[PDB]
Amino acid sequence: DPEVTLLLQCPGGGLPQEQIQAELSPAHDRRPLPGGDEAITAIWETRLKAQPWLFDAPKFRLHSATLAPIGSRGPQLLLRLGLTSYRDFLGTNWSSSAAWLRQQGATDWGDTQAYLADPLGVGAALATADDFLVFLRRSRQVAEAPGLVDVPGGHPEPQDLAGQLVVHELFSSVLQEICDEVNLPLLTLSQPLLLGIARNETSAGRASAEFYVQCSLTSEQVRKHYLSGGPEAHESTGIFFVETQNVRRLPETEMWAELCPSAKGAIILYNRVQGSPTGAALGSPALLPPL
Numbered sequence: 013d014p015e016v017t018l019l020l021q022c023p024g025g026g027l028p029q030e031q032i033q034a035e036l037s038p039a040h041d042r043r044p045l046p047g048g049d050e051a052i053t054a055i056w057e058t059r060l061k062a063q064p065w066l067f068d069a070p071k072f073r074l075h076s077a078t079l080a081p082i083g084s085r086g087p088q089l090l091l092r093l094g095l096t097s098y099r100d101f102l103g104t105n106w107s108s109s110a111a112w113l114r115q116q117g118a119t120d121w122g123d124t125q126a127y128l129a130d131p132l133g134v135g136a137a138l139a140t141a142d143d144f145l146v147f148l149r150r151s152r153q154v155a156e157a158p159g160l161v162d163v164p165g166g167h168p169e170p171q172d173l174a175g176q177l178v179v180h181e182l183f184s185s186v187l188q189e190i191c192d193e194v195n196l197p198l199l200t201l202s203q204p205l206l207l208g209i210a211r212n213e214t215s216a217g218r219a220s221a222e223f224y225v226q227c228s229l230t231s232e233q234v235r236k237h238y239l240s241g242g243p244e245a246h247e248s249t250g251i252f253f254v255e256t257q258n259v260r261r262l263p264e265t266e267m268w269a270e271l272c273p274s275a276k277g278a279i280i281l282y283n284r285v286q287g288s289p290t291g292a293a294l295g296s297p298a299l300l301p302p303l
């Protein structure tokens with residue numbers, strides 16, 4: 013699967029908020045473009061002259077993530093974060109010359125991402141009480157991945173001492189994205205666990221944090237809540253459910269070619285981190301069928 017690369021797989025079946033540190037520093041920001049940031053301003057001006065209702069918004073930028081030695085006490089992950097914006101994304105990762113910026117970053121900084129906005133996404137493997145994962149169909153009229161299958165998520169907007177507030181906003185934002193798009197009550201959702209980080213190589217390597225969330229409602233109750241909002245309550249055009257039993261072999265199905273890269277990342281990390289049992293009981297042939 014060339015359109016997705018794993019940057020991080022979390023240990024212990026996934027990390028809770030209390031085990032993650034963030035360092036938010038201007039040292040983690042995008043580098044100014046070789047010919048000046050005027051090229052981003054020019055793309056933005058041109059876009060507003062066709063769509064004058066568009067607005068900019070701040071975003072978190074992922075610089076890097078370091079995992080502690082496995083089995084250790086204390087914080088298990090450090091996230092190095094800077095700040096970016098929707099405007100900087102449209103002028104870099106979304107630009108037709110994004111591959112040229114990646115090559116110049118390798119040359120100048122030894123870092124393919126140095127000249128890229130790289131806004132941080134969040135996504136969820138959302139499981140129902142009757143053991144299904146939740147999937148959403150994208151509109152065929154949108155600019156990125158039209159008509160493809162997605163999972164719930166988004167790109168969080170800002171507002172270990174500033175750090176712990178940033179980790180809280182990341183975990184908070186995946187729950188808020190589930191409530192806004194699936195129309196679920198917040199009290200039906202578990203605290204999220206971080207499964208890992210995946211990169212979208214079709215969007216010049218931008219990364220998404222992928223989380224596991226468990227809902228106390230059944231698939232039928234989740235569908236009712238989603239539909240009861242009506243067409244204006246969601247950006248997606250449909251919802252559907254796959255048994256967790258069948259998610260194991262999803263990359264061998266015709267569904268796999270319809271999944272957007274960030275949803276592929278969520279399902280690969282769910283299979284590696286929540287699936288794949290390590291012990292004798294769940295490992296037994298009747299419970300883990302070979303092939």
Ligand SMILES: CS(=O)(=O)Nc1ccc(C(N)=O)cc1
Nearest residue numbers: 071097098101131132156167
């Ligand atoms: C049309 S989209 O599928 O919502 N794609 C996006 C990609 C990046 C950003 C960002 N973090 O600036 C926001 C949205």
